[PDB]
Amino acid sequence: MSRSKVFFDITIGGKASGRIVMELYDDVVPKTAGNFRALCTGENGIGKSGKPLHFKGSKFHRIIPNFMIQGGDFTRGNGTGGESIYGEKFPDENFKEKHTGPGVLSMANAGPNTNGSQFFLCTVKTEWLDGKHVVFGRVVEGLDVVKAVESNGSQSGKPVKDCMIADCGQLK
Ligand code: PRO
């Protein structure tokens, strides 16, 4: 069945750098896709954390060259935070989709069954994450914008400048 389309407009050090367009796999992982969709639109308002359940304004706090760009921590901004629309953590829905190449959209976590709002966009094939992170979508436009963000990461994960999701939402 159906697939939602969502976007991020990115700034890097405040400079507009383009739009990333993502297709979600609502047909394979509807609960996982649906959480991410709602966090793009902001439609579930204020969460248990007291902060908006919305990626807008948040950053890619962890970026690793030749690996992936990671965001979604809109409560702590640093990898410790994030909150799903379901309330904090939800189980791994399935591992039907794999990490096959750059562009893959997958959930960051802290171990089995700990999905929140943190996610990553792969800049390479990361087969070693298969069966441990739930893949729920892929980039279909703006992979160049993904690369631009990637150039600001470091081996340590720390970005050299703020890569921000200046706007986001759903297209259809
Ligand atoms: O941040 C990390 O290193 C792992 C791989 C991406 C999701 N969690």
Curated annotation (Swiss-Prot):
Main EC class the enzyme belongs to: isomerase
A UniProt-annotated Pfam family: Pro_isomerase
Reaction catalysed by this enzyme: [protein]-peptidylproline (omega=180) = [protein]-peptidylproline (omega=0)
Entry-linked CDD domains: cyclophilin_ABH_like
Keyword Isomerase: yes
GO CC annotations on file: cytoplasm
Keyword set includes Heme: no
Tissue occurrence: Exclusively expressed in the single anterior excretory cell.
Keyword entries, A-Z: Isomerase, Rotamase
Gene Ontology molecular function terms on file: cyclosporin A binding; peptidyl-prolyl cis-trans isomerase activity
Known EC number: 5.2.1.8
One example of a Gene Ontology biological process annotation: protein folding
Domain PPIase cyclophilin-type: 7-170
Protein family: Belongs to the cyclophilin-type PPIase family.
Job of this protein: Catalyzes the cis-trans isomerization of proline imidic peptide bonds in oligopeptides. Plays a role in protein folding, transport and assembly.
The protein's name: Peptidyl-prolyl cis-trans isomerase 3
Species of origin: Caenorhabditis elegans
Encoding gene, per UniProt annotation: cyn-3
